[PDB]
């Protein structure tokens, strides 16, 4: 009974502030955990720049843009894609950032997305 998409406002974290630097130890686990933390409001976003991914833990969970129209209410439509050892699980659009657990770090901005749950 989950609606297919949910509007979320994600805290954007600087990489050196992140305390828990990934969601788990396999592709399937990190996708599962990321979805749980999104549902619970305990998921942050790190914008990818040079130096960022080597300071985070693989497998990575990205949010990627899933369509070019719409963006209803200022929320870019996105979906989850995981990466391990240079192989991606999912194909989608441009990366908005890498998801990490949020455990109370102070963000620098909030990023509004319309997330495809599955
Ligand atoms: C505070 N977030 C709002 C919310 C409500 S239901 C929900 C959700 C349910 C299943 C999978 C995912 Cl990825 C998200 N998120």
Curated annotation (Swiss-Prot):
Localization per Swiss-Prot or TrEMBL: Host cytoplasm
Region (Disordered) location: 2-118
Domain of life where this protein originates: Viruses
Domain CoV Nsp1 globular: 4-118
Biological role stated in the UniProt entry: Inhibits host translation by associating with the open head conformation of the 40S subunit. The C-terminus binds to and obstructs ribosomal mRNA entry tunnel. Thereby inhibits antiviral response triggered by innate immunity or interferons. The nsp1-40S ribosome complex further induces an endonucleolytic cleavage near the 5'UTR of host mRNAs, targeting them for degradation. This inhibits the integrated stress response (ISR) in the infected cell by preventing EIF2S1/eIF2-alpha phosphorylation upstream of stress granule formation and depletes host G3BP1.
Name of the protein in question: Host translation inhibitor nsp1
Species per Swiss-Prot/TrEMBL record: Severe acute respiratory syndrome coronavirus 2
Residues of the full protein shown: 10 to 126 of 7096
